[PDB]
């Protein structure tokens, strides 16, 4: 609760049976944000 209250405050509205559907037939759970000015945004992370 403290980690997600720090950032990313959503775990799973779903149960686990719907969560397997997220894991396999990947739901676009994050909808297009309500405020977007320069095209789609992008990221990935590699720890060094």
């Amino acid at each position: 609760a403290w980690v997600r209250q720090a950032t990313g405050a959503r775990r799973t509205e779903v149960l686990d049976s719907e969560a397997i559907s997220i894991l396999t037939f990947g739901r676009k759970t994050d909808k297009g944000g309500p405020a977007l000015l320069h095209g789609q945004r992008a990221t990935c992370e590699v720890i060094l």
Binding site: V14, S17, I20, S21, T24, F25
Partner: protein, 289 residues
């Protein structure tokens, strides 16, 4: 009189038992040419498939399509083979399960393994559709599944046989005869301790048309779950599961076409029962305890 005169021209007109749909198939042939869609008693419908289910359906024609009414809101309706529920039916051998689980479960199916097993088949999540003619492997797999008729190649070029796997066919065979034989679909629930238990499934063939005389010879063979049916009924005051058997009509064929076969696919082979001139006659679910 000219009242009666306009009627006789309408009544000299029928030279066929309809002469209606034949005039449809001529003027639609005027619209472009030979239509591929005239000589068709069988009525199909088109199914856009999740691309991870591009398996044995794609290779062999004539498999039974089922919908899943999964309670999961965002993906719910997954189209399902008769081969697909072999991994759930305790009727089917476990080596037969892990054979086609290695076929289907290539990183795109394992949800339905947990979803059929955990969120158990209420005989309300599964619904009959028909058989597959004209599989379309493209970007999106377009199963043009039949609804009422014989499955065939276009222009009636080759009648597509019904594929029924051997571990679900044998244990409810009918008798030895050949005039006509039916296919009914039977789900039978044995009770153990905790759940429904991945219960069973059946493709029963019989000559019996009647509903009540057919379910009576199931009692000839399903006393064992009916032992467990009343056992969990006296062990449960308050809890309840659902009743013992669920039957529906699924189709009729010539019955001299009896031969079983084998399919050769990913992860080895799989012996099936190849029902040749299968007609799709979807009947209603008849539940029985």
């Amino acid at each position: 009189s000219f009242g009666p005169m306009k009627r006789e021209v309408m009544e000299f007109d029928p030279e066929d038992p309809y002469k209606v749909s034949k005039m449809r198939k001529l003027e639609r042939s005027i619209a472009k040419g030979y239509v591929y869609g005239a000589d068709h008693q069988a009525i199909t419908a088109r199914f856009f498939v999740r691309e991870s289910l591009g398996e044995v359906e794609q290779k062999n024609l004539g498999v039974l399509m089922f919908r899943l009414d999964t309670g999961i809101e965002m993906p719910s309706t997954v189209l399902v083979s008769l081969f697909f529920l072999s991994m759930v039916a305790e009727n089917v051998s476990a080596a037969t399960k892990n054979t086609l689980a290695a076929i289907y479960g290539r990183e795109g199916e394992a949800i339905r393994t947990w979803l059929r097993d955990g969120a158990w088949r209420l005989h309300r999540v599964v619904h009959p559709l028909g058989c597959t003619n004209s599989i379309t492997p493209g970007a999106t797999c377009l199963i043009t599944c039949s609804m009422r008729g014989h499955s065939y190649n276009m222009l009636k070029t080759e009648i597509y046989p019904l594929l029924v796997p051997k571990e679900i066919y044998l244990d409810l065979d009918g008798e030895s005869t050949d005039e006509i034989r039916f296919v009914y679909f039977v789900i039978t629930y044995d009770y153990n301790s905790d759940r429904q238990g991945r219960p069973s499934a059946f493709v029963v063939v019989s000559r019996i048309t009647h509903r009540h005389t057919l379910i009576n010879v199931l009692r000839y063979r399903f006393r064992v779950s009916r032992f467990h049916f009343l056992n969990n009924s006296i062990s449960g005051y308050g809890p309840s599961t659902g009743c013992l058997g669920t039957l529906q009509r699924l189709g009729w064929f010539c019955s001299r076409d009896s031969r079983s076969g084998i399919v050769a696919s990913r992860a080895g082979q799989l012996s099936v029962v190849k029902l040749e001139k299968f007609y799709v006659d979807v009947g209603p679910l008849v539940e029985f305890a």
